[PDB]
Symmetry: D2
Subunit: 489 residues, 4 copies
Amino acid sequence: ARFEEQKLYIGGRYVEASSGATFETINPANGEVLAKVQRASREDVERAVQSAVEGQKVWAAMTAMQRSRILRRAVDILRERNDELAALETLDTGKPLAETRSVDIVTGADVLEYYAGLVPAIEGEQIPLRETSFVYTRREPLGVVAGIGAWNYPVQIALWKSAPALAAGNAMIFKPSEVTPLTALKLAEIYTEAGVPDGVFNVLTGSGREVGQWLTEHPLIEKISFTGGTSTGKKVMASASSSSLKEVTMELGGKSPLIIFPDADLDRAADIAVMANFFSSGQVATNGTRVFIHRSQQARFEAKVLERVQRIRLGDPQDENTNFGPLVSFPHMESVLGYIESGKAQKARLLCGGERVTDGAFGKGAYVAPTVFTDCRDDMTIVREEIFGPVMSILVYDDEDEAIRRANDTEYGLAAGVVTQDLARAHRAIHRLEAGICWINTWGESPAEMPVGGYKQSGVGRENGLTTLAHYTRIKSVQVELGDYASVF
Amino acid sequence: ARFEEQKLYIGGRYVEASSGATFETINPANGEVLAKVQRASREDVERAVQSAVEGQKVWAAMTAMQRSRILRRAVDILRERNDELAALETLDTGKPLAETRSVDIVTGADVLEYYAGLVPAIEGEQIPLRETSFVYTRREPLGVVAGIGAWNYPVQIALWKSAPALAAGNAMIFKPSEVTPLTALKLAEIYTEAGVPDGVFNVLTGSGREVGQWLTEHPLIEKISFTGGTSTGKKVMASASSSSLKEVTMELGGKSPLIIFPDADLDRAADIAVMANFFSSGQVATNGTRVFIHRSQQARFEAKVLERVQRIRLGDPQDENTNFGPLVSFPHMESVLGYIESGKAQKARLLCGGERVTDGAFGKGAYVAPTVFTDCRDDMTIVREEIFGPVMSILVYDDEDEAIRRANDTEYGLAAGVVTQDLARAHRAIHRLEAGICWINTWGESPAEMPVGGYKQSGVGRENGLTTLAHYTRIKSVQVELGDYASVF
Amino acid sequence: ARFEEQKLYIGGRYVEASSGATFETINPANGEVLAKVQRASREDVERAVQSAVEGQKVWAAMTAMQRSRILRRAVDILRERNDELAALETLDTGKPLAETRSVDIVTGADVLEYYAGLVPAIEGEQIPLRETSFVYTRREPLGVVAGIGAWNYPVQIALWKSAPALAAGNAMIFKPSEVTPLTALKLAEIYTEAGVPDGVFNVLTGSGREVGQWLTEHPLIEKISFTGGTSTGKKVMASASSSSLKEVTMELGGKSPLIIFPDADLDRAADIAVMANFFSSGQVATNGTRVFIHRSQQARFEAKVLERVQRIRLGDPQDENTNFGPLVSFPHMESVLGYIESGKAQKARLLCGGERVTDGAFGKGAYVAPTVFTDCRDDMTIVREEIFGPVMSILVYDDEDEAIRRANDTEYGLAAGVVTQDLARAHRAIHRLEAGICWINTWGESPAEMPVGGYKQSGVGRENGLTTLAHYTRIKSVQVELGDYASVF
Amino acid sequence: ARFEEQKLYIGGRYVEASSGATFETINPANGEVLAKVQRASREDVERAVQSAVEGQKVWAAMTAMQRSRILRRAVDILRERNDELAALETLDTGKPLAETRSVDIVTGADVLEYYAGLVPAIEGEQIPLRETSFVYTRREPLGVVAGIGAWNYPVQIALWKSAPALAAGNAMIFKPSEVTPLTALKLAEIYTEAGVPDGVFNVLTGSGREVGQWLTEHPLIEKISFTGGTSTGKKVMASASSSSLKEVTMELGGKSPLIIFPDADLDRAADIAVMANFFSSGQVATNGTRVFIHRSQQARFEAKVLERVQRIRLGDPQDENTNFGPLVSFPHMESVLGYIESGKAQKARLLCGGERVTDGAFGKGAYVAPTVFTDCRDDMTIVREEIFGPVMSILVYDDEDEAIRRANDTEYGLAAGVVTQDLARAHRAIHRLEAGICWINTWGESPAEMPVGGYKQSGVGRENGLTTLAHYTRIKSVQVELGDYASVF
Ligand SMILES: NC(=O)C1=CN([C@@H]2O[C@H](COP(=O)(O)OP(=O)(O)OC[C@H]3O[C@@H](n4cnc5c(N)ncnc54)[C@H](OP(=O)(O)O)[C@@H]3O)[C@@H](O)[C@H]2O)C=CC1
Ligand SMILES: [K+]
Ligand SMILES: [K+]
Ligand SMILES: [K+]
Ligand SMILES: [K+]
Ligand SMILES: [K+]
Ligand SMILES: [K+]
Ligand SMILES: [K+]
Ligand SMILES: [K+]
């Protein structure tokens, strides 16, 4: 393998798993093996939890500013090592070096940086009741929490989950996707290097149906934060609930609507549509995979998108000039391809791509071409279901109300967007679109200040923003009685 | 039956259930049949959801102050009908008039009144990103939510759940306990009469394993708030998650510790202990059912408790002089009597009570004497397990840390309290107790301002206070882009 | 005199002033003497102060919800007496009944209602320092505060000032303008009737030459809230500061810019401009008295402005059909005509009005015509100075940065507003305008939720919204030390 | 002159004053002349203001995080140069190195570090009004603000004032005390080196009567924050107000009460009493200069105080073993000595100290001994007036209510504290004390998170805590109208 065997990270160091099993992570750009990775056993989960229980006590016993300084140090390291971490992430995800070098770690560290600064700002409340009595609340750490990551943005997700958790005074046990375990272990080394006490950020590798579930079930873990498919989320949330009533955050899937109004600049709109569909090779949960265009503009719009799509630079992720990589895994390419086939079979009109790219060494990698379907109907499987691949579904509408209604006609509610230049229409439409993450005349930016998460079946809770920090603490209310105590007995 | 048949309440009026079935509700003081009550069918649930969906739109379209005035009027009617409502709650629960007249509606209304005032105060945030882009959040209503109530404070629970839901622009479908459906239907009448749009507060009667589960499963219901046992909550929450990823609030069971430190006034400590065990015949979730007393004060404390217990006025709940009534039902009595038998069998010393009271008219009802066990030990069933009846367990300890360790040694974590005259000990101890609701030198008061709920397996989320109101809304983040849009493609 | 002699209001009743002096208030519509009004002596100020001190204790000893209910009862009485109070304010101000009936008391009560509901939401903070120490803050009432009202919205301003003051648990001594003293006395009666304790809202009649001055100087008064001219504000604040270090809030004057951009609907823009200029006969501090129109539209704009002005229904304020009344007083009419003179003298083109209206009955009142100057220039006295009367100055501009730069070129900064259909321009422009109150495509609406107040020399502090309530309490920080104390000596 | 001549700091470098004048800063330990310092001329003030104006635009043009990173950079530099700055402050103030090394820069930087993390957290609000309209608020920088420093903690004060000002996106012009100009100039360098844009922090030296007043009078400065005597603050505030309605912060004098209740541990009480009187040689505004002791404990308490005072190590500020330095100047020393004489004159019993220390090298410095007066009376000049030197007045009392009434009986109200082991007394007593800064069983600690400032004549506004950052922005409300506009005309 390219790298030595990846071990478990528990208590500020690597330790041997006790499962006697490993799995491989595969570079999707060429099918080669990057590393063999240990599977955590049930007893390894138990070792990580006790490690965290004790680590958390040390972390919590420090002052607010002590925690803040340690996390700012981690940020400093992440900045130093941005390129190196981006390179590792490219190997593990297949994503273009152009994306990983400027996005994954940058915005990951951005969020940690944001929370690091907010540690001393976590406050409770005080409420006078009467002269002889008052209450004050404390916002205590939950204790030991667990994050479970997806494969599309491995270290970013690991940072967005562990940043608020740790900033709130908690220990997090983290499980990356089997598909992409590498950068998570690197983060753990970095946290330790920065001063994060042993046990406070532990990483367990393995499958979700094993270690994932062992985590969601463990009695001592107070909260699960999960990122992945709506279908899987439902199972994960059910188990966190029924085992010990854990608190939960769920960041799930979507089929996010982009509505392009007639008064939009069809150039900006096309840029937004492609960006909302083809960045990270279509592997972004918030993607605007249902694009609504007015009938009077379909033709023109279809022409601008095509022109754009044709200049997309598919190629080796290692190539600085590549801005569109292979998909993350071969089985996922197979899934995506299935969808594109469904499209064809359902008489959706193909506008571009529509097939695997095999020319040359591309055949050794999991490449799918940027694909666009148009003349779509709301009942087509490619329009109802999340593909999580490079597949845009263009849809035609006749009036604003009809478009909003259709945009909302889904069990998903992750993101939504409008392109218009009219003041009233921008706000009017956005207020009516049933999604947690809404964009006006843009797409995809996710500032650390902005709470993001889904409506309906796209999630529970939120990540980022001031609100997310509070949701990593538990409220304790204390009534102080200074006066006499009355009894009816 | 005493009263005419009780029907469903949907869309501002009573409607016929479509199940073909009914159940009876019983006065536990004398076993009298109070009413035949209809069982909501699966299709009745659908009817109620569609009613709520449409009513919620009417309610949300009003202005903040319009909603506030309507809720305040509902508060006004409650004050008028306090006594009438108390009389009804007494019949249905067995709780003394002296409690229902001064606690249940008073404090149910206190919370509605609190939230009525805060409707106009619900706000989102605004964050500048750069000269050319900012974000604002909206706190939008969830839509339709479900409340599932418990039998011990039937109307107060419907109010504590319906107030924040309605104040935040939601509609709520409420299912009272099959054991005590009567006052919840009255609340629904009062809401309608106050101006609450039809469909905004609907009441469905029946069983939890049926109508409750149909509620937790329904895909158009965005949130469940549940009050009941920990075992039940785990099921409810699994159901709410697996079905459609609902938001959840859970107010569950407890085995809350009361630590009486050696510098306590033992008269106050005995008053506190008795109030924390025998109010509402011991049927209060936050009851301090494990009372820790220092070895050196055991005998004196016991004598004080005994003296107070002996003067407790067990009797007919319609008699104003009664301050201790029957349990809620015959099957709950049998449950409590079994716990009592467990305590005798495991060699706890019986300080007083310990049996059913059947003398005179009491034979017709479910009366269990206020009971005190002492010389208890941590491993005893009566100490480990929530009894939810008038059974106090006294436990001797030798030092402060020992007491705190034992107080914390439980899967519960609803409430906790200390009695001490020492400034440092008071706060030191409370800060280390793993419970959501903490009392110093008092017990039982639950101000509308004070967020209440459980640590650990005693709950998920909170009720009352500013924070709770927020958890009845969903965050929408809206990014406005005022400048150019950049595409990498 | 139409009414009997008006007395001081101290301690829940009318009492005789001790000055031996009275002033008259005049109906500006017909010159009728409405009433003689006693002027407070210095000794009367002292008496009002002691009353407020003892009253405030009683008010503050209540529970939050207790204060809330009393303020809500005052709100109910105000709604009952809306028309009656409107009639009286119409007599005293000359403002049209069509205004006083739908605006003054309505929005006055709106704010009191809003604050009524927020009383129980006033909270402090809690902050853990370390295991052995934490801090909590209390928000304590200031004590006795002073309100100084203006003559353009007498009862509304009295409401907007006393509502947050009383809601935060203070007592207020209020001084209405000598010009409009009548309704403030009525509000005092109402508060008493609603349950406001004696002394908590005392009214002292007199002028800024005597009583106003005694209040700002009083050692025992903790805060001054002032509405009036920037010039008077500077004196008031100086006196308030140097005398005893008072908190001050000041709502002062303006010369607010209204920028019509080239893409604006001119019908709306004209609607906006006339409203922004002639409501309450131009007697509104936030009036958009500098209207920027693009050279290309100057012609079409003036036409629509002129068409609207000409249909203004100047007339007797007691006629429901009137929508434009006389000015508040003859001395203020003289001031306004003075400015109209200046505009003529300085060669500004007079589009309409420009003169005292004297036809028939109007000759006995203080009517001035809706006046529009155009072709104005930035150095014109009418363009730089606040007229506070029905006088719109239209300014031509060429480009967007120019209009903004010019809108900003003033020592004022109360309001500003833009008219445009463009999403980007609307926000981009408003963010650059240096005013505390900014309108997009509308004017004048001042929602209870919306903090209002001035940039630069247009004010200090704010009125309305959540933030304002906080400024009627002082912060006390409490550090609790539970651990050891360390000394270097 | 130990150092070269000190120039004005403007626009990122030292520049020449245009006054032609200078003053000397002394060293109170030896009389040495540390430097000559140029007086800023009225035109220099004009210069600093225009520099500030342009710098602010640069600062504000950055992102929140960029600003954050720069202030964190500054913090790092301060930690490095902690000892070196300490040594300089020790020369310019006379305070023991033992203090300056561990307090002045440490806690100065603490506050900067705190606010650096909070820059991104500054947010406005969003308020829906109806389907067609909503408002949002922006918290914009004030612009240019001024700080006027005091001489007891020169660099800490400059940090506490500029930290929030800069974090909120303002430029500050700071004027050190003539008595202690050195460290302020060093901080200006440090900021510039950290990356703070030119103009954002400028230092002008000279008199308050002149340059102080020129700053408070300037029409382009938006706010003044001042620290010094109540007498002067009143003047300063009047000027800031009468000139242009500037927002103001005033941290002023006090005569803070310390109440030792009869259950207090006397050792802890004596330690607190001495820390509260003799740290920084008694030159701290929040000092407990009036110590109330119960009659029953007076003798034992005085004894314990004496024992501690006798072992105080007065000596050379340069020596590491000194914990009690000379006063800040010979003039200030005379003032203190005057007070000390008044005390002798009025027959207070001198427990110890009460004269200058002249033995040896001490005669070359402004050394007053640690002085304790006992048997004081409330009307003594030493009890009524702030001495600002090493003088403790001990006051006997008989009961709690008395002690609280006497504690409150003063026009000051900066700080207060109690010593007691009783939970109820501690909170009850503190709630009744009219001071902004209250300590329980401790004294002196001032967490970055804790808002600190005075009641009554001890101040206006606060320093530190979340609240202070907010008062360095101004609120703009924006109403967005998305529907029709209605005109009565
Ligand atoms: N919206 C998003 O962010 C993502 C959505 N998806 C959607 O999911 C589909 C399949 O991708 P897939 O790889 O299956 O992603 P999943 O959603 O199945 O998995 C996400 C994460 O959850 C873990 N997990 C999987 N099953 C369980 C379980 N039973 N209990 C606890 N944890 C579990 C996984 O571990 P492991 O997989 O290592 O076994 C992984 O870490 C895709 O088509 C895509 O549409 C997928 C990934 C991210
Ligand atoms: K991989
Ligand atoms: K959800
Ligand atoms: K019943
Ligand atoms: K829980
Ligand atoms: K008048
Ligand atoms: K101002
Ligand atoms: K000096
Ligand atoms: K003050």
